[PDB]
């Protein structure tokens, strides 16, 4: 029946972690890094978000509700004067170089930065360029390590505990870092130290991911929207700068569309846009993502 093939891969065999995660990094992840990425998902039942996410991707018009939501935030982004910083690599996964270049020209107030060879987790291939460029860009606004040496923070959100990194000073505009699938705040570990000297860095683990709680949800995008909206409010955030990636970019752009006065800049990379046909998905990943959605 529907879903059996993709669930066997992602839920039973843990393919998103053991296979697709390496497919998203140009360099080889170390065993220590793999173990940090594996930690939330040792129990197969906890792998639901890893499977629902690729089934939410807006590919070939489906699911229609996600396609519409993403089209809406992309239209918002095209009409917004907010400062934008777009990182891209070659060949990319979600964003081919030609699309990055086009968006750098068509989006208002947008600087683009080539990180060199990159797939999906650009932060793993060139953290020092991404971090240093974010830090320089923040200084203009009108506002590779394997460890995770951050003090834990936890906040109750709609009755569920969410984990986050929170470092840097409390007397400015904070920078909110949003990860995607199948990562956690760990993906930002080598970016945050470039920013923390000047700006507060807040990096939550999405519900069901990282060190956040694992409620019995379907882990649709709607669930992530609800929990991230409530996380932001539970921290009392007013205005923010966003640094977003992958499904975290869908969260960040959708939040910005709904809260435009509160977004003072967006840095983004390997982000969710509508993929009109399977031909626009990279061949090396096409049979994999088709199977995930079977
Ligand atoms: Cl995904």
Swiss-Prot record:
Cellular-component GO terms for this entry: membrane
Keyword Hydrolase attached: yes
Reactions catalysed according to its record: 1-haloalkane + H2O = a halide anion + a primary alcohol + H(+)
UniProt cross-references to InterPro entries, sorted A to Z: AB_hydrolase_1, AB_hydrolase_fold, AB_hydrolase_sf, Epox_hydrolase-like, Haloalkane_dehalogenase_2
Its EC number(s): 3.8.1.5
Enzyme kind, highest EC tier: hydrolase
Keyword ATP-binding tagged: no
Pfam family, one: Abhydrolase_1
Recorded GO MF terms: haloalkane dehalogenase activity
Domain (AB hydrolase-1) ranges: 4-294
Associated pathway: Xenobiotic degradation; haloalkane degradation
Active site as annotated: 120 (proton acceptor), 246 (nucleophile), 270 (proton donor)
Signal peptide location: none
Keywords noted in UniProt: Detoxification, Hydrolase
GO biological process, alphabetically ordered: response to toxic substance
Disulfide bonds: none
Subunit structure: Monomer.
Function: Catalyzes hydrolytic cleavage of carbon-halogen bonds in halogenated aliphatic compounds, leading to the formation of the corresponding primary alcohols, halide ions and protons.
Family the entry assigns: Belongs to the haloalkane dehalogenase family. Type 2 subfamily.
Protein name, UniProt field: Haloalkane dehalogenase
Organism per entry: Rhodococcus sp
Gene of this entry: dhaA
